[PDB]
Amino acid sequence: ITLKESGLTLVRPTQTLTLTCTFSGFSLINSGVGVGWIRQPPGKALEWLALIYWDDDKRYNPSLRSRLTISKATSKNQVVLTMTNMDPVDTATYYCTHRGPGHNTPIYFEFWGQGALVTVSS
Amino acid sequence: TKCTLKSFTVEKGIYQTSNFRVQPTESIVRFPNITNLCPFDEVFNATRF
């Protein structure tokens, strides 16, 4: 099972961030399977952005709602995340992670991407 | 031979006492290459109930 992030890593403020997690080893058509995004500032704790189950349940972080749109492109086995109005405080690493089934309860974040350092400056 | 004539003394001659028949040594069942299982793996491993 593998994940990999990609997009533009540097953008000025008042612009929009786009990221694309292309994965391999699971499909967002089975039951259970889902894909999420988590950002982490440099030297800080993690933060949850959004999540999208296999039946298209687009959960969002409320405080970051009204800014986020998550969508899937299952045909290409890839997911796209979008966050507008970037700022220098949004400099972080963005991982795309996987939630599958366990043995008596769903597993969450068992496998991670490798991050994509995103800098917002000029 | 005595049992057929019901007599302890049998006279000179030829007598047809019984018959013999080799018995079957095995039993076999033979049916065609029958292979066409129906989809239980589709209703139990369905994608979304």
Integer count of domains of chain A: 1
Work out the radius of gyration of chain A: 14 Å
Quantity of strands of chain B, as a count:
0
Percentage of residues in strands of chain B: under 5%
Instruction: Please state the overall shape of chain A, judged from the principal axes of the Cα atoms.
Output: globular
What is the end-to-end distance of chain A? 36 Å
Find the structural class of chain A using helix and strand composition.
Answer: mainly beta
End-to-end gap of chain B: 79 Å
Largest interface between protein chains, with number of residues from each side = A-B, 5 and 3 residues
Instruction: Give helix and strand order of chain B, one letter per element, not per position.
Output: H
**Helix-strand sequence of chain A:** EEEEEEEEEE
Region (Disordered) (chain B): 21-37
Organism (chain B): Severe acute respiratory syndrome coronavirus 2
Glycosylation sites (chain B): 25, 27, 33, 45
Protein name (chain B): Spike protein S1
Structure description:
Chain B: This is Spike protein S1. Chain B: Glycans are attached at residues 25, 27, 33, 45. Chain B: Residues 21-37 are annotated as: Disordered. Chain B: It comes from Severe acute respiratory syndrome coronavirus 2 (2019-nCoV). The structure is cut from a larger assembly and holds chains A (122 residues) and B (49 residues). Chain A is an all-beta fold. Chain A has a single domain (2-120), classed as Immunoglobulins (Immunoglobulin-like), CATH 2.60.40. Chain A contains no helices and 10 strands. Chain A has strands at 2-4, 10-11, 17-24, 34-40, 47-52, 58-60, 68-73, 78-83, 92-99, 117-120. In chain A, the strands form 2 sheets. Chain A has a 6-stranded mixed beta sheet, with no helix packed on it. In chain A, a hairpin with a 4-residue loop joins β7 (68-73) and β8. Chain A is globular. Chain B has one helix at 2-5. Chain B is rod-shaped and about 90 Å long. Chain B has 49 residues and is largely without helices or strands. The A-B interface holds A 29-31, 54-55 and B 47-49.
